Design a protein around this ligand. Sequence first.
Ligand SMILES: [Mg+2]
Ligand SMILES: [Mg+2]
Ligand SMILES: [Mg+2]
Lengths: 221, 449, 450, 451
Amino acid sequence: AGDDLMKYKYVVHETAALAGKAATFMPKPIAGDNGTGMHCHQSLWKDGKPLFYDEKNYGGLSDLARWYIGGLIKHSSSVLAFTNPSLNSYHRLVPGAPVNLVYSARNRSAAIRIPPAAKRIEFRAPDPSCNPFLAFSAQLMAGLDGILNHIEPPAPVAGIKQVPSSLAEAMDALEEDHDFLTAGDVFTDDLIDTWISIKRGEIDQARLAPTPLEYELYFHI
Amino acid sequence: LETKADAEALINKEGIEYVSVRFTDLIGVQQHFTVPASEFLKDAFTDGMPFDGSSVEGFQDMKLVPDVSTAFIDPFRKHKTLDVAFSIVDPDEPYSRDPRQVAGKAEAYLKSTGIADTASFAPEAEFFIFDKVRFENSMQRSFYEVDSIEAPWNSGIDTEDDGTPNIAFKNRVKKGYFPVPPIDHTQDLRDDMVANLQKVGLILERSHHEVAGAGQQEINYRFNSLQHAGDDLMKYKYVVHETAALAGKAATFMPKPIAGDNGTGMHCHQSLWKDGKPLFYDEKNYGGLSDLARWYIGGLIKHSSSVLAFTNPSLNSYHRLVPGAPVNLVYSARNRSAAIRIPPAAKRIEFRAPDPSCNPFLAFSAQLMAGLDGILNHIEPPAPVAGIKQVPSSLAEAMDALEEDHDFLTAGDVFTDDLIDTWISIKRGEIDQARLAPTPLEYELYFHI
Amino acid sequence: LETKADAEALINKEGIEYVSVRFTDLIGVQQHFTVPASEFLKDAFTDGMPFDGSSVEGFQDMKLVPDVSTAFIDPFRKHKTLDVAFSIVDPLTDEPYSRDPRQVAGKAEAYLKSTGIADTASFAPEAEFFIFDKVRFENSMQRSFYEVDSIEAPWNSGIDTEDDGTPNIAFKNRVKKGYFPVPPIDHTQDLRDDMVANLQKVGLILERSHHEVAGAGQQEINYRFNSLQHAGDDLMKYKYVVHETAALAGKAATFMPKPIAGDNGTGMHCHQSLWKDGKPLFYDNYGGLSDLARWYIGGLIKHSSSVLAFTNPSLNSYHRLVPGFAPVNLVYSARNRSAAIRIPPAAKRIEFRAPDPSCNPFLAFSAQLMAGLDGILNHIEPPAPVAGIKQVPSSLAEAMDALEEDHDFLTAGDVFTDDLIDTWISIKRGEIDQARLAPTPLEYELYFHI
Amino acid sequence: LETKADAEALINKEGIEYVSVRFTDLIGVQQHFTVPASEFLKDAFTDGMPFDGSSVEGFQSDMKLVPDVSTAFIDPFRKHKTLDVAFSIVDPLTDEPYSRDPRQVAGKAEAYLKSTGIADTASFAPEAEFFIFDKVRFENSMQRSFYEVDSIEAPWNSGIDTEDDGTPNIAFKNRVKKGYFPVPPIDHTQDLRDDMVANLQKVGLILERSHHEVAGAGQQEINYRFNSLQHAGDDLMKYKYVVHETAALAGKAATFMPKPIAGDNGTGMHCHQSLWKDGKPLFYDEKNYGGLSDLARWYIGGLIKHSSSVLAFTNPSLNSYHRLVPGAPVNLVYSARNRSAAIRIPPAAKRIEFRAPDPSCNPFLAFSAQLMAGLDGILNHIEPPAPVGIKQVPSSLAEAMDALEEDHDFLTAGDVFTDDLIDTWISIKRGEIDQARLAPTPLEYELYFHI
Ligand SMILES: [Mg+2]
Ligand SMILES: [Mg+2]
Ligand SMILES: [Mg+2]
């Protein structure tokens, strides 16, 4: 699926370029209009058979599926370090766009929506400015830790867990909560430390850069 | 000037036609309306001047009370005009969100504690002189562009704005401090500002070109008591802006207009006085500082994050306050990275953190209240010179600390809860605007991905 | 000035070469013709000045009678000129012309004294206005547009160079934040002071001048109050000074209630108070108001839609009179900023915030007085101070519908003639018909792709 | 087409690569998303096509689309071979008709007509005029507000020196109100009009007439054969799509605005109307005024009585009341000769021509409202006024919405027009009036700037 998206990105970019145009997967190129999100539909299969479906539940979700959500919510800010790894990512995730870490079937403000072999979990939080291999893996490892620890997610709906307010906050969360990633040596301390280092480098660049907004706000003062 | 009759005498003598009833809003921008000179003399000293503050940013009827001591003749107006500063009161009681009133009540709380009677502040407000400034934030595009004839990026230009060929002698990066003309192109304009500042009452000391080659300047004048020091800086800003504006240029107090060169800081010199005697002096300590001076530092260090919420209140402030600028909260004498610096009566404390994009009344008061809190509670500062306390990393973090620590400001009702709650609410809104706006840097980093 | 001898004395003391015989039309525009100074002294006081009122909008040979006290030296005219306001009368009878708005204001003052309620109706308008650097508009078959511009405008923060070719030095205004920072943020300070000086020169006693909320060059100048008719004369002189000072400065000044969208419009708050034998009558009670002042408000609320037909007579007026955050609630208060009538002893007055300065001051001030008087005489209690709050009209036609239905409080004492009311409605309905024909740029945005 | 096998056979033969899943929103603009043809033959007939109408104007979780294959046609504009198919909106669980689906309302209107027994079919024939411009631009900002149209036929270009292509002016341009209907070269858009006519024939329309209309700035009209109410709505949506695309791919712009320009003729959409039962006409009766039966006469009375509420759907734009001006079917009366009448009467050809509507409306909602009003008159024997104190059209959109708000029981009959739809429609149109309430006009600058 990571190979497909990279192939998907390559075609979109090239087809636009050869047409004399430019295609981008920026989560928020312009202000005042809708951003660009990459909803992720995920599910677990075994012996060619689905696992998330169960007639005895809210959205028709097996305990294996509900725990997957619970792990996704508990490790939310850590997962978003890979699903929303850009400074620009947090101009789309503005509470003005999913920002409430809670799951529901009807509500749209939920980061996790639930639409037998079609029963799946939809993570609306991510955006396509991410590495698909890293983004899809982090979501899987988050769910598995929820299943292995029977993590019960909050009740399907003023005290909802929120997405980080910045790229800096997400990296602090990833730095203090990544044991669920290092399980089975899937993610290594080498990669994690490198990922944080690179992203904190991009934060430092933003720390040095004056913005046109600040000119509008503070120049006359 | 001091009396109603003193003002009336000056009006007849200089033929003053109008009076600019001006004051400072919460943000730090001077607001005014103009009335005939006879109308000023008739009402301002009696029932004062009424105004609707419904549109003034950071307030929401109110009454304006004159302070003739701050009066000066406007050197920019076509018609002869007298500029007078007013304090806001209830139509009587001192207004909660008037910054100048905070400075006044701060001077009173100082005396009430018996610690001192006078707190002398001396700002070092730097600034930039640009030949052109333009910016925009729309859906399709967002930009800012400055320009200067001194700028190093213009070294290879063919023709200047006036049609005359390039005759070079433009500044280099971080090398504008401080060669003589023709390298310095803004010496004569700086002198115009210096002259106008002397004309409007200020006692000046020094003026020069600053580090940044893109036309950064600095003018220094003599210190004064807290409230008057705030008045002097507002007068300093108004004259600097106007003089450049009438010269076809733009002057700004942005802490960081351009990237890759020095930002703009406003070093604040601090000193407490009593009975006409210095209180920071003691030849038996580290930096010749008294125990009181040492405790003043400690209180400023402990509440630093809450203090910098007023001294560095803009989003742009944290593009100057970057490690690699005084970002370390510790005091010394020789060190040049320390936030607090120590250079009998001349013995004073230099806080190098603040920038001139702040409200001077609030900025100077916040520093005093922090110091006095350190004096009253004997707060010992860390030793002079890896656990060195840093400045806040963002504007949001600064507002977080102000919310959790503001009791030292509300002492003696100097800072009101209504003001601090308003100040936070305003700044959070600016942060929310940044949360919405995409940046050119993000295009450079993320577009191709 | 009071008489012919006083006029001749001034003509000599100032060397006046010509006399501008001016008068206000029914709409609210000042009309005039210029005569030599000697010709003015020779005929104006004896047989008056005749003119052909066939081509004056809303009128159709009548006689003009001077009010020397309205005279003032023109500070704009190349040749030394004295401007004098005149009154229109029937030559063979000297009877006041039915459609003369200045006469309506004069007949309102006379009716006021007949009631015994008061002898003086003071009015003080807070007329705001915009100063633009460029104004252009057209209404053809192929196109229909308007385009305003200002050096202070927020939409020019990103331009490279200005009108004079000089680089952008910023300090331009932001939306709804032009009230009222000091220069250089205020680029129209020296021009406003030029206006203030001219207003003082022509005889107005000024109080205040400042930049307004709208960043695109909106200002406001306040001056001392006056009796109804004279306050109408002063406001006409006010608008002329503002128009000419801006024009000769190479700019355009407008009293349009809403020239631009997204930012604040232009209003004209009217401060009202009744006086008798030199004593204030509104002072007493809640808000420091008297029974006479409260009944004045009640009559102002009851005939509101009819009064607004004169105080807000533009199609442009109802783009400011919008519930979109504006005085649209017919209720009086002292603290509420939503009340169309506000209450801020000799200063205890009524502030009507609804009107805009695109109206006829003579007709506007009269309509407010006649409404108040009707409330006083009939003991009309206003709604309680502060869901069922009375609203301003949602259209110009609705205002004309109300005026066509409720106008008897105006015809009392023959202040407003039926001839004037019908003619006023006819002109306004004619303007409504013009809008009924015209497509708008908004409609292209909404309906073209369909 | 008729069945699933028909479409599948066509896709193979014509090599159809994609399928445009289309529907009409509440306002009247066709919405769509494109899927592979194979994907369309796998899910549409069984599970249907799911979508989220949260972003669609006037719809608000996910809803369900069910195809009406008889509406299918091959797109003559797409680079890739595409089959355009219209869909109906139902609940993804109950398969029940979505209330805010205009096409479904038209389908529910044909069902109520049968339940009465008066007829089994209502036939509608629109006379939709339109404008063709070479350039159209508009903007509504704080600093300025404008619109500008241009045409090579335009009378305001008679004195122009150089055309858009660089060639000199060779005249033969129209004069004001005199484009009906000179032969070329005076008619500059004959070949483009014929291209539109050809494409309309290609997509399955049975065309009757094509010509240049009154307004000299590129006004045209293309007539096609009548049809049943719902399918007549389908044909018009396809009609407007072909017109829009043919002009667009010709470097031009086509609009159905009732009054794009002032000073010249407006654009209208006359709606011919007739009721049929068992193949027999019902509006014909030899021994009456306009050959009208009691059914036809009562139908008119229903139209007249609920005229203002009907015009809330037939003339639902602010721009509509710049055409509906007493300068135009304003008088709600019917005549067999008088053109000033809002209703005109021109044996199986006897029909009712409503001249009020304009093509800026939703055809599904427009045709349905006229029938329900007409059906209301029949069920109550509502007699219209004497053929020739005359009822006028609303003077504004607000008056129409005010009238629809008080008089709409005839629409709610048989669950055709739900209360949710009517409330939403009113709420949407009052939002547009609010926009007009906020926007200054160029006319006001002419009238009030100098004051
Ligand atoms: Mg320096
Ligand atoms: Mg005002
Ligand atoms: Mg036609």
